Each structure stands twice: as C-alpha cells, then as structure tokens.
Amino acid sequence: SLDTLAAKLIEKAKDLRAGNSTTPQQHEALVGTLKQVQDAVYLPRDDLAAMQMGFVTAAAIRLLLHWKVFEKIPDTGSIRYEELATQVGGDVVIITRICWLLVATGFLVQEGSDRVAHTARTRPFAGVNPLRAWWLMGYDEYVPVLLAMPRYYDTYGIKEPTGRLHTIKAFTEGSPELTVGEIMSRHPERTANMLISMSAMASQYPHTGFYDFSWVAPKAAESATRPLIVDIGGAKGWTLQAICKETPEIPISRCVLQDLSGVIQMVQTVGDEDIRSAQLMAIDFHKEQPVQGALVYMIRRILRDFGDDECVSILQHVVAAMAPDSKLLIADTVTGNPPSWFPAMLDFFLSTIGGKERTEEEFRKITARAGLRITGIHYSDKAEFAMIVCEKA
Template identity: 40%
Template sequence: MAEMGAIRMFMKMKAFDKIPLGGSISYDDLAASLGAEVPLITRMAWMMVATGFLRQIGEDRVAHSRLSELYASGNAQGVFFQIMFDEAMVPWVQWPQFFDKYGLKEPKLGNHNPHSFAWGDPDKNFWEVISKYPERLVDFNQSMNTLDEVLPVTGMYDFSWIAKAEGPEDRPLIVDVGGGKGQALKRIMAAFPEIPAKRLVLEDRAPVIEEVIQANERGFEDVQKIPHDFFMPNPVKGALVYYIRRCMHDWSDENDRIILSHLADAMAPDSRILITEQIMPNPPTALNAWTDLCMMNLGGKERTEKMFDALTASAGLKMVGVHKSLATDVAVIECVKA
C-alpha cells in the first residue's frame, strides 16, 4: 500500500519524467525540479528503492528500473495503474465508512456508490465525478478504448442472418444502444459488409453522438446517429436487433432492469436483444472477482449466466442463447420477448 501511494504521488508530480532514461538524478535536483522538499521526495523514493521499483545510485542519486520507466507520462501501463488507484483503490479503502453509512447491501444507484462517496460527491454518478477532473477523464476513456479493442465483438455470434431478414426496407436492422463512437458497430460492419449501413443505428448520449457526426468518418456516414439516454424509452421502435455491449456491468440490477424494459417495449414480436458482457463462472476466477469489485465501486456488477437469466426475465425477456468466446469470458446473450 505504501509503495502504491508513493508511485501515485510520483506520477501526480510527474517525477518519473524527471529521472533521465539511462542515467540518474540527485534527490536534491529531483526535489528542486518538482518544487518539493528534499526529505519528502527522498522518503517516497526510498520506498520504491526498497521494493526494486526504482534504483538508488550511491547515497544520493536515483535511477529508473525497467518497470518504473513505464510509469512516465504517456505510457499505457502507468495510466492503467493511475486509473486503478484513483477509481478503484481510493474507493476500496473507504468501504468501511461507506457501508457504515449506507448499510451492508449492494450499491443500487448510479450515485451514492463507493466511488462518488470516496471522492466527496455522493449525489453524483461516476461520470459526473470524473468529469470534474479532465485529465483523469481523458486517461480513463483512452484506457477503456484500449481494453475495448482487445475484447471480441465478432466470432461469437453469427450476424449474417440479419442481412437476409425479410421485411420493410426501411426497418432498422441493428440499433447499437449506448454504442459510444461506434467502435463495435464498425467491427460488425467490417465482418458483415452485406448488412447495409443505412439500416444501422448508433445511439449514445448527445455529446458523444455530436462528436461522431462532426468526425464524419468515411464508411460510417450512412449509419443513423441518434442521441439517446437508455434510461428513457427508446425512440427506435421495431428494430430487428437491439445490441448493447459492455453497458450492463456498469449498472445495478435495478438500473439494468429499466434499460432492458425500455428495449423490450420497443421490440417487435420478432426482434432480438443481443447483450455482450463478461459472464462470470461460479466460483469466479481472481480476475473475475477483482473486476466485479471494481464495478461495485461504480454501482455496477459482473454477473453469472444465472444472474443474467434472472435479470432479463425480470424485464420481460427470455434468454434463448448464450454465444461464448473461446478465448475470453465475454459472451453474447440472445434474448426475445417472453
């Protein structure tokens, strides 16, 4: 814990940037470059020297290790550590106070969760809190985009039937609900080019959709782009497929029930909902459990297949298929109206 605190402070001060690659710097010069007291910088550095994270040269100079170099500005590994410290560790260490205040029960709201409580804004949700810190928001979004790129979109579910579906030519074929800037939709389009772009719909919050419209990316121009809050009734009625990827785990059962109920209300009798999420085994792996507790900080949760079955049923849906990835815990859960 002490080492993590020292690393986070060095990142905040950009102290790792001041240590020359392939060289060393005196504690005096490092402190002066940061506008800090020498004893403070020395004591923090000594913690990292003791663990091997930094190297000390003689008695008064410090140098990088191969690991610490990755924590200078702009390195993905350092950014991920910073995100985990700020958005996970800070809330975790305040769990005792949080559960004393709110009781021994799962966080059920977008606000009044461990994250908003720890950062002093209990009435706000995660996005409202982190938006007050622009640098953290940029780092978080970049890190999540990187993670998103390595998680599968295609290869689990065969979308090819969608292009062959009969019906009116103006019927939307896929509505990507909460689809961000269309990252997943673009991968579906690339894998299944026979699905007409003009019959695809991207939905997300108004600022996100405006960014997509302004970007006017080639090959994505014909996709319909609609601002939408998925806690409100869906404006696109009777689409063939409503696709929602990596959104369910951000929210509690109560909130997800609202999201799915609105989709169920928008469905035609032959519509499908495709939910792409990580499915936890029971018992979970250490990584599954860790991810779940990260999500609990935000008022969300990871779920087992049985949990998804109960959740979808509570929203008037029936699970008819679980299409799993061979390489990850990610799966596509296929639902129809019950």
C-alpha cells in the first residue's frame, strides 16, 4: 500500500542516518512494494507514458555514452555544461537538453542552473565495467532486433523460430544464412564488449547447492576406470571444480570438461590446479560425444540456446555414448505455465537466436525423442532453475 511503502522509506531513511547498510533483500522488498503501488495507482495512460519515457531515457544514455560525456562528469562534485561541451567539442545547447532529460528522471543532478553531476545511477557509465558493457550489448545488439520482429515474422510467417540459421538476429544483421556466432566473428569490438557482459551475468545462476552430486562417490570407489562426470560445454571448468570441492570424494582427475578448442587452450594455460588436472577435450557437441560410458553427462544452460530438433540431436549423441546406468543431467530453467518474469524475458530474447525456456512438458518431449526418461527435477531457489535428471528409457 501507500502506507507500507512510506514505512519502508522511513526505515531506509533511518538506517541511512545510522550508517547501517541496507541489505539486498531489503532493497528488493522496497522496489517490490513500489511496483505494487504503481501497478495499483497508474492508469493505462500512465503506464504507456512511462514506457515511452523509458525509450528516450535509454536513447539519451546511449547518446551520452557515444559522446563520452559520463567520463567527463566527475565522480563527485559538478561540472559546468559549458565546460562539458568544450571537452566534447559539441554545442552546449543540445548537450544541455540531453542532460535535462536525465535530470528530470533523476539520473543526473543539477547543482545550480549551469552545472550537472552524477548519481549512483549514472556512475557505472563513466568507465569500463561489466554493467556498462551489458547495457550497451543489450541496447546495440538487441533493441534493433526487437524492432525488426514484425518484419521478420512477415517474412518467415508467424512460426516459432527454431533454426540456428535464419534467426531474427541474423535476419536483422542482414546475413540470415550465417549463424549468430559466425556473424559475431566478423565483429571484434562488439565481440569484445560481449565477453565482458556475457561473463558477468553467468554468475547469477547457481552451480551447486540445490542438487546432491555425492551419489557419484560410490562408483568412484567401486571402479578405478569409469569416467565420472562429463561437463558438455562447461567453459572454464568452474562447475566441475565446485562440484569436486563440495564433494572431495569425487576425484576431479576422473571428470571431463568438453568445450571448443579455443576455450580448452585457455584452461590449460592460465587455468587453476584442479581444472587442469581434469581431462580437457576440444569437441563439437553438435556432432560428437567421444567419452563413452561415463556415469554422468551434464548439459548446463545450453539447451535453452537451441530449437527442439537441435536439442534432440545433441541429446541423441550423448545417449549413444551412455551406458545403461548412465545419467544425463540437464541444468536449465523449467519455466512454469505461465512463467515468472525473468524467465519470460529470457525466453523472449532467446527467440532472436532460435532458443527458448522450456516447460516441464516440453522437456519431456525432447528427452523422449532422444530415448530418455526424466526421473527427477530438483529446483534451485532462483527463477525455476532446476536440475533435470534423465536415464535411458
């Protein structure tokens, strides 16, 4: 209500005078209560106007980034508009009008009528960092594709995009006959910025803590030879390291990391003690799975990137290598019907590259098509992220 929102502002205001640090959960509770009050108070005209304002605040921020203006505003204190325009080489009038939009939305602050200053909301834009990179990637790489969607579906029909080719991203870029990865290989700077961002937001999903891997330990003791955990597309090998430190009875010596040759070379050179002690193979999981009869094959946050047929083909390669008692673990979102907002928004983005978040029923369909049977689903506490346990059917 309006009253509980005021109560949380009073608590915040108090904790700030006392120098106590707000907690993350406290911050979300306050943002949540605000959104509930706005939902209750805003009329449709208010929602639509706020949506339009979001467009121009984003465009203002994009233009000031392009002009390198956030770098020139000091961390603290104020800079004169005239001084800012001189350092940019631009007309003070248009630079002032753009800042005025951000002043009226509380992104910037004016200290007189001629000086402007940062807030906590704009300091991330004043230098290189993962959040700025993520912001720019989503704006430059995603918003144009969002605008092209009606045109895209006019062209291909109102159909779920499921291929790796003729994606909406590639269609927007003008090369529908290339994959997104081939497009990005033609674009070093955009790929560089994407690494910084794609790496940061991976750490928002948990690797362990909601699924017990320790049942692998008995087999590690009955047999000296059987490979234990094969991580398919596991990147730097951090998942395997965590699993084996959570359960030291699982020798990382007997686990396998599979990725692309360029990523396996980085694991060997500047990788740490134990990941380097594990078998590292450069593979293409679209076409092959060399390790035969391992106890566990793991596919974490990968199937979301592909359509059903591509997932079934990936799964069928793994099933061909599985022994009768092998498990195939899929770590991914099992979205609800209907889905919560974060997975719903990820699913929307994924439609630009041919992927999707899948419901439980959709996961049963693709696993059944691969000759698998889901025996369990173990949920994390984070946005329906689960461990899906499968066996040969």
